[PDB]
Coordinates of C-alpha atoms in Angstrom, one line a residue:
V1 CA 0.0 0.0 0.0
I2 CA 1.2 3.5 -0.9
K3 CA 0.6 6.4 1.5
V4 CA 2.4 9.7 1.8
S5 CA 3.6 10.6 5.3
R6 CA 3.6 14.1 6.9
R7 CA 7.1 13.7 8.2
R8 CA 8.5 14.1 4.7
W9 CA 8.4 17.9 5.0
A10 CA 10.4 17.9 8.3
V11 CA 12.9 15.5 6.7
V12 CA 13.6 17.8 3.8
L13 CA 13.4 20.9 6.0
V14 CA 16.0 19.5 8.4
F15 CA 18.2 18.2 5.6
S16 CA 18.0 21.4 3.7
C17 CA 18.9 23.2 6.9
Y18 CA 22.1 21.3 7.6
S19 CA 22.9 21.3 3.9
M20 CA 22.5 25.1 4.2
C21 CA 24.9 25.1 7.2
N22 CA 27.4 22.9 5.3
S23 CA 27.2 25.3 2.3
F24 CA 27.7 28.2 4.7
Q25 CA 31.0 26.7 5.8
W26 CA 32.0 26.2 2.2
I27 CA 32.0 29.9 1.3
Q28 CA 32.4 31.6 4.8
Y29 CA 36.1 31.8 4.1
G30 CA 35.6 33.2 0.6
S31 CA 33.3 35.9 1.8
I32 CA 35.8 37.1 4.4
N33 CA 38.8 36.3 2.2
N34 CA 40.4 39.7 2.7
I35 CA 40.3 39.4 6.5
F36 CA 41.2 35.7 6.8
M37 CA 44.4 36.5 4.9
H38 CA 45.3 39.0 7.6
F39 CA 44.3 37.0 10.6
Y40 CA 46.1 33.8 9.7
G41 CA 48.9 35.5 7.8
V42 CA 48.5 33.3 4.7
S43 CA 48.3 34.0 1.0
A44 CA 45.0 34.1 -0.9
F45 CA 46.1 30.8 -2.4
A46 CA 45.5 29.0 0.9
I47 CA 42.1 30.6 1.7
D48 CA 40.7 29.8 -1.8
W49 CA 41.6 26.1 -1.2
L50 CA 39.5 26.0 1.9
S51 CA 36.6 26.2 -0.6
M52 CA 38.3 24.2 -3.3
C53 CA 39.1 21.3 -0.9
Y54 CA 35.5 20.2 -1.1
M55 CA 36.0 19.5 -4.8
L56 CA 39.0 17.2 -4.4
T57 CA 37.5 15.3 -1.5
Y58 CA 34.2 14.4 -3.3
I59 CA 35.9 12.5 -6.2
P60 CA 37.6 9.7 -4.3
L61 CA 35.5 9.5 -1.2
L62 CA 32.1 9.2 -3.0
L63 CA 32.5 5.6 -4.0
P64 CA 33.1 4.4 -0.4
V65 CA 30.4 6.8 0.9
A66 CA 28.0 5.8 -1.8
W67 CA 28.7 2.2 -0.7
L68 CA 27.7 3.0 2.9
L69 CA 24.3 4.1 1.7
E70 CA 23.1 0.6 0.9
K71 CA 24.9 -1.2 3.7
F72 CA 23.8 1.1 6.6
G73 CA 20.8 2.9 5.2
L74 CA 20.0 6.6 4.6
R75 CA 19.9 7.6 8.3
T76 CA 23.5 6.8 9.0
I77 CA 24.6 9.0 6.0
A78 CA 22.6 12.0 7.3
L79 CA 23.8 11.4 10.9
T80 CA 27.4 11.1 9.7
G81 CA 26.9 14.2 7.4
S82 CA 25.4 16.3 10.2
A83 CA 27.7 15.1 13.0
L84 CA 30.8 15.7 10.9
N85 CA 29.3 19.1 9.9
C86 CA 28.9 19.8 13.6
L87 CA 32.3 18.3 14.5
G88 CA 33.9 20.3 11.6
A89 CA 32.4 23.5 13.1
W90 CA 33.6 22.9 16.6
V91 CA 37.1 22.3 15.4
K92 CA 37.0 25.7 13.8
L93 CA 36.9 27.7 17.0
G94 CA 39.9 25.8 18.3
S95 CA 41.9 28.0 15.8
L96 CA 41.3 31.6 16.9
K97 CA 45.1 32.4 16.8
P98 CA 47.2 33.5 13.9
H99 CA 49.5 30.5 14.3
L100 CA 46.6 27.9 14.5
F101 CA 45.8 27.9 10.8
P102 CA 46.2 24.1 10.4
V103 CA 43.3 23.5 12.9
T104 CA 41.2 25.5 10.5
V105 CA 42.3 23.4 7.6
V106 CA 41.6 20.1 9.4
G107 CA 38.4 21.7 10.6
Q108 CA 37.4 22.4 7.0
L109 CA 38.5 18.9 5.8
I110 CA 36.1 17.4 8.3
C111 CA 33.3 19.5 6.8
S112 CA 34.7 18.5 3.4
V113 CA 34.0 14.8 4.2
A114 CA 30.6 15.9 5.5
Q115 CA 29.6 17.2 2.0
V116 CA 30.0 13.8 0.5
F117 CA 27.2 12.6 2.9
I118 CA 25.1 15.6 1.8
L119 CA 25.5 16.8 -1.8
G120 CA 24.5 13.5 -3.5
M121 CA 21.6 12.8 -1.1
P122 CA 18.8 15.0 -2.5
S123 CA 17.9 12.5 -5.2
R124 CA 17.9 9.7 -2.6
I125 CA 16.0 11.5 0.1
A126 CA 13.3 12.7 -2.3
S127 CA 12.8 9.2 -3.7
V128 CA 12.3 7.5 -0.3
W129 CA 10.1 10.1 1.2
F130 CA 7.9 11.7 -1.5
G131 CA 5.2 10.5 -3.9
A132 CA 5.4 10.2 -7.6
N133 CA 4.4 13.8 -8.1
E134 CA 6.4 15.5 -5.4
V135 CA 9.6 13.5 -6.0
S136 CA 10.9 16.0 -8.6
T137 CA 10.2 19.1 -6.5
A138 CA 11.6 17.6 -3.3
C139 CA 15.0 17.2 -4.8
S140 CA 14.7 20.8 -5.9
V141 CA 14.0 22.0 -2.4
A142 CA 17.1 20.3 -1.1
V143 CA 19.1 22.0 -3.8
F144 CA 17.2 25.1 -2.9
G145 CA 18.3 24.8 0.7
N146 CA 21.9 24.1 -0.3
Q147 CA 21.9 27.2 -2.5
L148 CA 20.4 29.3 0.3
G149 CA 23.6 28.6 2.4
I150 CA 25.7 30.2 -0.3
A151 CA 23.4 33.2 -0.3
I152 CA 23.5 33.5 3.5
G153 CA 27.2 32.8 3.3
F154 CA 27.7 35.8 1.1
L155 CA 26.0 38.6 3.1
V156 CA 26.1 37.4 6.7
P157 CA 29.9 36.8 7.1
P158 CA 30.9 40.4 6.0
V159 CA 28.4 41.8 8.6
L160 CA 29.6 39.9 11.7
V161 CA 33.3 40.3 11.0
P162 CA 34.4 43.9 10.3
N163 CA 37.7 44.7 8.5
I164 CA 39.6 45.6 11.6
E165 CA 43.4 45.5 11.8
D166 CA 43.8 44.4 15.5
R167 CA 44.1 40.6 15.7
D168 CA 42.8 40.3 19.3
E169 CA 39.6 42.3 18.6
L170 CA 39.3 40.5 15.2
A171 CA 39.5 37.1 16.8
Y172 CA 36.5 37.9 19.0
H173 CA 34.2 38.8 16.0
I174 CA 35.3 35.6 14.2
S175 CA 34.7 33.6 17.3
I176 CA 31.0 34.7 17.4
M177 CA 30.6 33.4 13.9
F178 CA 32.0 30.0 14.8
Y179 CA 29.7 29.8 17.9
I180 CA 26.7 30.7 15.7
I181 CA 27.6 28.1 13.0
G182 CA 28.6 25.7 15.7
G183 CA 25.4 26.4 17.6
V184 CA 23.3 26.0 14.5
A185 CA 25.1 22.9 13.4
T186 CA 24.7 21.3 16.9
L187 CA 21.0 22.2 17.0
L188 CA 20.5 20.7 13.5
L189 CA 22.4 17.6 14.7
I190 CA 20.0 17.3 17.6
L191 CA 17.1 17.5 15.1
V192 CA 18.6 14.8 12.9
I193 CA 18.6 12.6 16.1
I194 CA 14.9 13.1 16.6
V195 CA 12.9 13.7 13.4
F196 CA 15.0 12.2 10.6
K197 CA 13.8 8.7 10.4
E198 CA 15.4 6.1 8.1
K199 CA 12.3 5.6 5.9
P200 CA 8.6 6.1 6.1
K201 CA 6.2 3.4 7.4
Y202 CA 4.8 3.0 3.9
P203 CA 6.5 3.4 0.5
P204 CA 5.7 6.8 -1.0
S205 CA 5.5 5.7 -4.6
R206 CA 4.9 2.7 -6.8
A207 CA 8.4 3.3 -8.2
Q208 CA 9.9 2.9 -4.7
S209 CA 7.5 0.0 -3.9
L210 CA 8.9 -1.8 -7.0
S211 CA 12.5 -0.7 -6.2
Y212 CA 12.5 -2.5 -2.8
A213 CA 11.0 -5.7 -4.2
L214 CA 13.5 -6.0 -7.0
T215 CA 16.5 -5.1 -4.7
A216 CA 23.5 -7.3 -6.0
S217 CA 27.2 -6.5 -5.9
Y218 CA 28.1 -2.9 -5.4
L219 CA 30.6 -3.1 -8.3
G220 CA 28.0 -4.7 -10.4
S221 CA 25.7 -1.7 -10.0
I222 CA 28.7 0.5 -11.1
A223 CA 29.3 -1.7 -14.1
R224 CA 25.6 -1.5 -15.2
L225 CA 25.6 2.3 -15.1
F226 CA 28.6 2.7 -17.4
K227 CA 27.2 0.2 -19.8
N228 CA 24.2 2.6 -20.2
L229 CA 25.2 4.9 -23.1
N230 CA 22.5 7.4 -22.1
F231 CA 23.7 7.7 -18.5
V232 CA 27.3 8.2 -19.7
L233 CA 26.2 11.0 -22.0
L234 CA 24.3 12.6 -19.2
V235 CA 27.3 12.3 -16.9
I236 CA 29.5 14.2 -19.3
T237 CA 26.8 16.8 -20.2
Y238 CA 25.9 17.4 -16.5
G239 CA 29.6 17.7 -15.7
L240 CA 30.1 20.3 -18.4
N241 CA 27.2 22.3 -17.2
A242 CA 27.6 22.1 -13.4
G243 CA 31.3 22.3 -13.8
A244 CA 31.0 25.5 -15.8
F245 CA 28.6 26.8 -13.1
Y246 CA 31.3 26.1 -10.5
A247 CA 33.9 27.7 -12.8
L248 CA 31.5 30.7 -13.3
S249 CA 30.8 31.3 -9.6
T250 CA 34.4 31.0 -8.5
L251 CA 35.9 33.1 -11.2
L252 CA 33.2 35.7 -11.6
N253 CA 34.7 38.2 -9.2
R254 CA 37.9 38.6 -11.2
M255 CA 36.0 38.9 -14.5
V256 CA 33.6 41.6 -13.3
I257 CA 36.3 43.6 -11.4
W258 CA 38.6 43.5 -14.5
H259 CA 36.2 45.4 -16.7
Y260 CA 34.9 47.6 -13.9
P261 CA 37.7 49.0 -11.7
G262 CA 36.6 49.2 -8.1
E263 CA 33.0 48.3 -7.8
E264 CA 33.7 45.3 -5.5
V265 CA 30.5 45.9 -3.6
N266 CA 28.5 45.4 -6.8
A267 CA 30.7 42.5 -7.8
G268 CA 29.6 40.7 -4.6
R269 CA 26.0 41.6 -5.3
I270 CA 26.3 40.1 -8.8
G271 CA 27.7 36.9 -7.2
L272 CA 24.7 37.0 -4.9
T273 CA 22.3 37.7 -7.8
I274 CA 23.2 34.3 -9.3
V275 CA 22.5 32.5 -6.0
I276 CA 19.2 34.3 -5.4
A277 CA 18.0 33.9 -9.0
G278 CA 19.2 30.3 -8.9
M279 CA 17.0 29.7 -5.9
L280 CA 13.9 30.6 -8.0
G281 CA 15.2 28.5 -10.9
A282 CA 15.7 25.4 -8.7
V283 CA 12.2 25.6 -7.2
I284 CA 10.6 26.4 -10.6
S285 CA 12.4 23.5 -12.2
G286 CA 11.2 21.2 -9.5
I287 CA 7.6 22.3 -9.9
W288 CA 7.7 22.3 -13.7
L289 CA 8.9 18.7 -13.8
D290 CA 6.1 17.9 -11.3
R291 CA 3.4 19.2 -13.6
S292 CA 4.8 18.2 -17.0
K293 CA 7.2 15.2 -16.3
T294 CA 9.0 16.1 -19.6
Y295 CA 12.5 15.4 -18.4
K296 CA 14.1 15.0 -21.8
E297 CA 12.6 18.1 -23.5
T298 CA 13.2 20.3 -20.4
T299 CA 16.8 19.2 -20.1
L300 CA 17.6 20.1 -23.7
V301 CA 15.8 23.5 -23.7
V302 CA 17.1 24.5 -20.2
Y303 CA 20.6 23.4 -21.2
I304 CA 20.4 25.4 -24.4
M305 CA 19.3 28.5 -22.6
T306 CA 22.4 28.0 -20.4
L307 CA 24.5 28.2 -23.6
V308 CA 22.5 31.3 -24.7
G309 CA 23.2 32.9 -21.4
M310 CA 26.9 32.3 -21.8
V311 CA 26.8 33.7 -25.3
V312 CA 25.0 36.9 -24.2
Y313 CA 27.2 37.2 -21.1
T314 CA 30.4 36.8 -23.0
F315 CA 29.7 39.6 -25.5
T316 CA 27.7 42.0 -23.2
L317 CA 30.2 42.0 -20.3
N318 CA 32.7 44.0 -22.4
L319 CA 30.0 46.6 -23.2
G320 CA 30.5 48.4 -19.9
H321 CA 26.8 48.6 -18.9
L322 CA 27.0 47.1 -15.4
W323 CA 23.2 46.8 -15.0
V324 CA 23.2 44.4 -17.9
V325 CA 25.4 41.9 -16.0
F326 CA 22.8 41.5 -13.2
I327 CA 20.2 40.3 -15.7
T328 CA 22.6 38.1 -17.7
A329 CA 24.2 36.6 -14.7
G330 CA 20.8 36.4 -13.0
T331 CA 19.3 34.7 -16.1
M332 CA 22.3 32.4 -16.5
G333 CA 22.2 31.6 -12.8
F334 CA 18.5 30.9 -13.2
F335 CA 19.2 28.1 -15.7
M336 CA 22.4 26.5 -14.4
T337 CA 21.0 26.3 -10.9
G338 CA 17.7 25.1 -12.3
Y339 CA 19.7 22.4 -14.2
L340 CA 21.1 20.8 -11.0
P341 CA 17.8 19.3 -9.7
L342 CA 16.9 18.6 -13.3
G343 CA 20.1 16.7 -13.9
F344 CA 19.7 14.7 -10.7
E345 CA 16.1 13.7 -11.6
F346 CA 16.9 13.0 -15.2
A347 CA 19.7 10.6 -14.0
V348 CA 17.1 8.7 -11.9
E349 CA 14.9 8.4 -15.0
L350 CA 17.7 6.9 -17.1
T351 CA 19.1 4.7 -14.3
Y352 CA 16.1 3.3 -12.4
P353 CA 16.1 1.1 -10.4
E354 CA 19.8 1.5 -9.5
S355 CA 20.3 3.6 -6.3
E356 CA 20.0 7.3 -6.5
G357 CA 23.1 7.6 -4.3
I358 CA 25.3 6.4 -7.1
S359 CA 23.5 7.9 -10.1
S360 CA 23.4 11.4 -8.7
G361 CA 26.7 10.7 -7.1
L362 CA 28.5 10.0 -10.4
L363 CA 26.9 13.2 -11.8
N364 CA 28.4 15.1 -8.9
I365 CA 31.9 13.6 -9.6
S366 CA 31.7 14.8 -13.2
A367 CA 30.7 18.2 -11.8
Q368 CA 33.7 18.2 -9.5
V369 CA 36.1 16.9 -12.1
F370 CA 35.1 19.4 -14.7
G371 CA 34.6 22.1 -12.1
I372 CA 38.2 21.7 -11.1
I373 CA 39.5 21.4 -14.7
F374 CA 37.5 24.4 -15.8
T375 CA 38.6 26.4 -12.7
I376 CA 42.4 26.1 -13.4
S377 CA 42.1 26.0 -17.2
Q378 CA 39.9 29.1 -17.4
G379 CA 42.1 30.7 -14.8
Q380 CA 45.2 30.4 -16.9
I381 CA 43.3 31.5 -20.1
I382 CA 42.1 34.6 -18.3
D383 CA 45.6 35.4 -17.1
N384 CA 47.3 34.7 -20.4
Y385 CA 44.7 35.7 -23.0
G386 CA 42.0 37.7 -21.2
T387 CA 38.5 36.9 -19.9
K388 CA 36.9 36.9 -23.4
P389 CA 38.7 33.8 -24.5
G390 CA 38.0 32.4 -21.1
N391 CA 34.2 32.6 -21.6
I392 CA 34.4 31.3 -25.2
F393 CA 36.4 28.4 -23.7
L394 CA 33.3 27.7 -21.5
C395 CA 31.0 28.3 -24.5
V396 CA 32.8 25.7 -26.6
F397 CA 32.4 23.0 -24.0
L398 CA 28.8 24.0 -23.5
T399 CA 28.3 23.6 -27.2
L400 CA 29.7 20.1 -27.2
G401 CA 27.4 19.4 -24.2
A402 CA 24.5 20.7 -26.2
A403 CA 25.1 18.3 -29.1
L404 CA 25.6 15.3 -26.7
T405 CA 22.4 16.2 -24.8
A406 CA 20.5 16.0 -28.1
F407 CA 21.6 12.3 -28.4
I408 CA 20.2 11.3 -25.0
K409 CA 17.1 9.1 -25.5
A410 CA 13.9 9.6 -23.6
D411 CA 14.4 6.3 -21.8
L412 CA 12.4 7.3 -18.7
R413 CA 12.3 4.0 -16.8
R414 CA 10.8 5.1 -13.4
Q415 CA 8.0 6.8 -15.2
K416 CA 7.1 3.3 -16.7
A417 CA 7.1 2.0 -13.1
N418 CA 4.3 4.4 -12.1
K419 CA 2.3 3.9 -15.3
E420 CA 1.6 0.2 -14.6
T421 CA -0.5 1.0 -11.5

């Protein structure tokens, strides 16, 4: 028997909250980058890697973590993700001295492991908790919560910590931040103890009801996924999109400031505009897939509009009209961020009934791999040739992704599971 449970909204609310906190810790060093250089006495190279360290950790650690999902269940993953998120925050405030930078690094690495238990989960949490209609929008809300942390992590950190020169007074203001994040993370950890069950009393969908019945080697499931040509094409195309989005967000500050001397306040606002606009895009994408369930057609059109946004952004950025960048970065951030819940849910369609922890996990690895490759490669291109070739470099790889996306078949397998009734 299929019956939706009321707890599903608390589960996503709690998960999106501690994914919000984990995303806060990702960019809390980037927002205060100028000050953290002065406090710890390190180069900007080190502080940038406190955010980049999440990318290198996801790639190797996912396959063990994605293996823990079947063996120990979903609850252990969220508990480990929230507890390490809490532990990684309490290690931070052991480092309020200029000479205690390594404690910050190991504190961030603990949060870095905590992401692997978080970022690939939205597809898995939505499947096990939500019905056939809400399954697409629930994954969007979790991505919506994750993106909210980046938005909160852009405007809150510069408020709590002023740009003061005295270390002793500076350490106090940073300490309040670590208590707030540590306090929030510990409270969210306590919530995960209570409300976050392993699975509802009844299956939420006929797709999940069939998934449990048919559910053997972990390496066998990996082998099946890479035999699927459609999934392999989706992994590459999703990586080229989400990877370019990570390359866009990380490198946008240096591109905008290059054309507009000064204007760092607006440059931070443009970076916030993508995150805020992406919040609308993520939710709209989830609701649209709920009503229409046209995963293949939506993926192609949304991904093309991502290419169009890059084409417009590349050639209008040089124009010098700063108010244009808000719309183009906002429009582009609307579609790339709306692609993330769309990519995760399209992967589940192509790879049902294999676990959503691996399918959306391998999509994330591609995003991390291309996100790293595009970050350094576009960084050298911008330094050596300027930002205009840097954006065209992203445009070319988004063009190849556009062609490959057109070759993905509409092999929606979990839709067929619900149709049988």
